[PDB]
């Protein structure tokens, strides 16, 4: 017991062998609540961590002529400023293995749940370059998200990089976790990081995960506002290394960057404290370098490099409903698609808010499944028609049938777009939904009861036609007997529900 | 210690210590000066250690007044970073940021001191048993329910609310609350805090004849401070709460005024600390110590700290970075839009942006949730039709929109509340409301039963039955 601990002590002090190598060292000039400057260090490289005298670890950013600035990875109390500090030589790796699944950590990937030490054998450089264009490929695998419109209008594929730029406090974290819970089915290990939230929020979110069973296969790297600036500056890099490493172990992956606006805010904070001369809107020039090196790290592999899929779904929220703010206009200039989750669109009652106006996709429809084209092209047309001719609704009473019927179908499709908080609705739940929406098998109904009609619809048919489930899951293509069985179930369920 | 410091360059409210090069203290350590004054030298001003400029000169901001100080005047170091006397001794006394009582009674014992700078609590120790507490103010109770133990976000311009709201909130929930409280007074007006202390005396919650009966402690960083005090009175209120969380193990509701004063004091001093200007003009290290102050306030299975932050957005410019950070910090946010109280809809909480994370139907009793989403949709319809009603006249639009505008107008006028201290602005007596009472009231309004009454009948109402009394009074006084 304790004597075995003493013999562990004995084997470790015999493992101490007096290794005599050269260590770079220097003295503390000034510390400044995040910034520390020391002089007398040449052979330190760029972006290298050192270790101080007290035990506080710090990383070096600017190698100035006279001194060298090191920024702090913790609490800067016991700095003595006249004491000596030494160098390390490592490039700030993080140890890694499988056992992080369901664990929560700091930016150093060191555990904070107290659920034991993660048995991490392998490791990885943080500042890894992205995979090249030759390792990159196209996108075939559809990513599922469970939501009607964003399964529908801007679909997302395993491999590509979709972005959501909803405004202040309107439902971004919600729909992110709904994608997570929608990935209960497949083998994909999503990667959740939460930056700059309160700890109570992220604890509430991970307890929601504990309830839904996501903790068997999720990973949370939550770096709340308590931590110093460098930790939140490099935390999404750590999450990215986790993603890319496990993608190199041939697994399917996605990531949820939380508030790259907070990332960039922390970056301009620590950098301007470090006397990096400020550039546009007081952010230094390499903020785009940061976000590009973070986001475009995610890609789709080469199918001889293992065919892992990495999909970047980050979040940036913008001050008071803007497009022309700095880092949002940067990240739309860099990434493929965008999604506008607007505040008044939420407050109007659309659950949840999707502007289907300026929301465009570079990949467009190329990542949807084969049945999704058939169910969705007519949907795209109908949404364009309602979004254009919508304002006539105030006298669609007076208008003719060709606009009137079409406006009624458009608005009840907007009511179809409503979906509750965290209802995991995969592909077979929604292809029938969009199918009866575009076939008009419910347009006799009025403008409220359609939601309960649809939930009774999908429950009954999900219990009634497991062969429909199978031919959805196997073909991913609407055959005519599938659509026949579909309309049969529609007539039966519509009959029963109409009779109540 | 034995480092007899020397003062080198007095730069406004920011000064500096020349030290013997061997021994210098560390960050946030106290530095008490041997200051003089208008007669003698019984002057003692503290200084906080921010950063040390290399060759035996440091950067330090004085808390108290920076007048009458010479270069080379000696300072005294401590080694204890400002251990502030918080225990059961502090109850019912207005304290200073130096841990000094200002209410001209005797000094209490300083056995229970604790340093103002410390580690934020760990992640895993974090009590999440999510439940709401009620107030009796309809427009936040119906709309954006207040999580017990979380944080409450009160944003508003200068003169739209935020003072009678917090006065009514202490007036209700302190006497409703078995645990003790703390009001920090960080940079509000000295008259209003004085009047709060008078109100507290009148309420008997202090019982100024007795210290141990008093359920509150007071700290006032008023406007007379140099900003070194104005950036630390917030954390003094923090450690006053923190002793009551840890060492007292009882739940404490927490009342703070404008944190924007605190962060703008940081913006005031970061120019002269030897740091640089930032985004739009604040301090660079905004969110770091902002989130320090935040995440040092939470509920961790030993006591509950519900908290109300009255952060002042300047001139309704919501693009501001510190309230932008605080937006993600908080739990229940209420913006107090000026255009409402410009129309006199007291209190002027916007029904559109305001929310909580407590809007889970599976925590709020789903009929309540249906009600709230329905009425928010209704107000959204009104505000979006605001563009064309001043263009197309009242009766261009359809008749469903007509009754929609009418009923929405009635409900937004029904958003009033005669508070029990609003009488110095209304004169009508203060009125207390329920919760299920208001639920039934708003369902009976928006369902359209009393959808014929005068629009002034539903104004300054306790509830809808009170509104029916005012409706019959109005239809008496209208004919005569």
């Amino acid at each position: 017991r304790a004597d075995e601990i003493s013999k562990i002590i004995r084997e470790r002090i015999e493992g101490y062998n007096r290794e005599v190598k050269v260590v770079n060292t220097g003295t503390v000039l000034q510390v400044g609540d995040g910034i520390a400057r020391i002089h007398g260090l040449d052979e330190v490289m760029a972006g290298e961590l050192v270790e101080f005298e007290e035990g506080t670890i710090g990383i070096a950013l600017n190698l100035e002529s006279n001194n060298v600035g090191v920024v702090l990875m913790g609490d800067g109390l016991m700095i003595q400023e006249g004491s000596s500090v030494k160098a390390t030589g490592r490039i700030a790796q993080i140890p890694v293995s499988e056992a992080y699944l369901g664990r929560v950590i700091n930016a150093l990937a060191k555990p904070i749940d107290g659920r034991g030490e993660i048995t991490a054998s392998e490791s990885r450089l943080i500042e890894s370059p992205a995979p090249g264009i030759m390792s990159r490929r196209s996108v075939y695998e559809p990513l599922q998200t469970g939501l009607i419109a964003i399964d529908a209008m801007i679909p997302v594929g395993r491999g590509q990089r979709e972005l959501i730029i909803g405004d202040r406090q309107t439902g971004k974290t919600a729909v992110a976790t709904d994608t997570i819970l929608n990935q209960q089915g497949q083998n994909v290990i999503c990667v959740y990081v939460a930056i700059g939230q309160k700890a109570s929020s992220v604890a509430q979110v991970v307890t929601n995960f504990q309830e839904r069973g996501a903790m068997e296969y999720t990973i949370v790297v939550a770096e709340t506002a308590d931590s110093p600036a460098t930790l939140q500056y490099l935390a999404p890099y750590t999450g990215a290394a986790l993603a890319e490493y496990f993608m190199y172990r041939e697994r399917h992956t996605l990531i949820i960057y939380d508030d790259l606006s907070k990332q960039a805010q922390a970056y301009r904070q620590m950098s301007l404290l470090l006397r990096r001369p400020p550039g546009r809107e007081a952010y230094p020039g390499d903020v785009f370098y940061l976000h590009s090196r973070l986001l475009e790290r995610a890609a789709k592999l080469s199918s001889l490099l293992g065919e892992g899929s990495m999909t970047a779904l980050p979040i940036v929220e913008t001050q008071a409903g803007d497009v022309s703010a700095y880092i949002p206009t940067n990240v739309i200039s860099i990434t493929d698609g965008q999604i506008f989750l607007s505040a008044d669109l939420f407050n109007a009652g659309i659950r949840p808010a999707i502007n289907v106006g300026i929301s465009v996709s570079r990949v467009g429809s190329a990542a949807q499944i084969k049945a999704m084209k058939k169910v969705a092209g007519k949907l795209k047309l109908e949404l364009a028609q309602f979004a254009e001719l919508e304002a006539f609704a105030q006298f669609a009473s007076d208008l003719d049938k060709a606009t009137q019927n079409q406006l009624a179908r458009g608005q009840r499709l907007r009511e179809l777009l409503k979906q509750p908080q965290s209802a995991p609705l995969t592909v077979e739940e929604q292809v029938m939904t969009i199918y009866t929406g575009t076939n008009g098998y419910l347009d006799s109904l009025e403008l409220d009861q359609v939601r309960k009609y649809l939930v009774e619809l999908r429950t009954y048919v999900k219990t009634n036609k497991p062969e429909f489930q199978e031919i959805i899951s196997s073909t991913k293509t609407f055959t005519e007997e599938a659509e026949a069985l579909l309309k049969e179930a529609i007539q039966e369920q519509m009959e029963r529900f109409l009779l109540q | 210690k034995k480092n007899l410091g020397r003062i080198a360059q007095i730069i406004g409210p920011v000064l500096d210590v020349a030290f013997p090069p061997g021994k210098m203290p560390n960050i946030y350590n106290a530095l008490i000066v041997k200051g003089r004054d208008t007669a003698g030298q019984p002057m003692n001003v503290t200084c906080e250690v921010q950063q040390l400029l290399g060759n035996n000169r440091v950067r330090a901001v004085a808390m108290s007044a920076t007048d009458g100080l010479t270069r080379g005047m000696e300072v005294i170091d401590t080694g204890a970073p400002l251990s502030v006397p918080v225990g059961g001794a502090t109850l019912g006394r207005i304290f200073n940021v130096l841990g000094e009582p200002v209410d001209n009674l005797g000094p209490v014992d300083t056995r229970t001191t604790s340093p103002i700078h410390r580690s934020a609590p760990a992640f895993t120790q974090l009590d999440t048993k999510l439940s709401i507490f009620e107030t009796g103010i309809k427009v936040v109770d119906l709309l954006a329910p207040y999580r017990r133990g979380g944080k409450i976000g009160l944003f508003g311009g200068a003169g739209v609310g935020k003072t009678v709201l917090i006065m009514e909130l202490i007036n209700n929930i302190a006497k409703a609350h078995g645990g003790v409280s703390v009001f920090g007074g960080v940079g509000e007006r000295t008259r209003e805090g004085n009047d709060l202390y008078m109100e507290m005396k009148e309420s008997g919650v202090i019982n100024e004849q007795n210290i141990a009966e008093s359920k509150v402690a007071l700290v006032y960083g008023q406007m007379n401070e140099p900003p070194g005090a104005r950036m630390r009175v917030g954390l003094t209120a923090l450690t006053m709460a923190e002793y009551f969380r840890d060492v007292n193990e009882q739940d404490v509701l927490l009342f703070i005024d404008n944190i924007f004063r605190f962060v703008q004091a940081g913006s005031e001093v970061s120019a002269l600390l030897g740091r640089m200007p930032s985004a739009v003009g604040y301090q660079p290290t905004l969110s770091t110590e902002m989130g320090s102050l935040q995440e040092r306030i939470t509920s961790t299975k030993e006591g509950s700290i519900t908290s109300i932050q009255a952060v002042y957005v300047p001139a309704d410019d919501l693009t501001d970075p510190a309230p932008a950070t605080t937006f993600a910090h908080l739990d229940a946010t209420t913006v107090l839009s000026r255009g409402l109280a410009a129309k006199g809809i007291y209190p002027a909480v916007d029904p559109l942006d305001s929310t909580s994370t407590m809007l889970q139907p599976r925590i709020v009793g789903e009929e309540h949730y249906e009600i709230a989403q329905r009425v928010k949709e209704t107000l959204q319809r009104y505000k979006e039709l605001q563009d064309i009603i001043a263009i197309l006249g009242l009766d261009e639009l359809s008749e469903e929109d007509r009754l929609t505008v009418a009923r929405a107008r009635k409900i937004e006028r029904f958003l009033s509340q005669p508070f029990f201290v609003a009488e110095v602005f209304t004169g009508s007596p203060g009125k207390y409301v329920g919760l299920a009472e208001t639920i039934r009231g708003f369902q009976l309004i928006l369902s359209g039963e009393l959808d014929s009454l005068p629009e002034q009948a539903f104004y300054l109402v306790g509830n809808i039955d009170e509104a029916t009394a005012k409706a019959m009074n109005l239809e008496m006084e209208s004919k005569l």
């Binding site: 008071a320 409903g321 | 309704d316 410019d317 919501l318 693009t319």
Partner: peptide, 12 residues
């Protein structure tokens, strides 16, 4: 901002 947000309101 205060104008520019309000000018966004006016444009919309």
């Amino acid at each position: 901002c205060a104008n520019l947000r309000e000018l966004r309101d006016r444009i919309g």
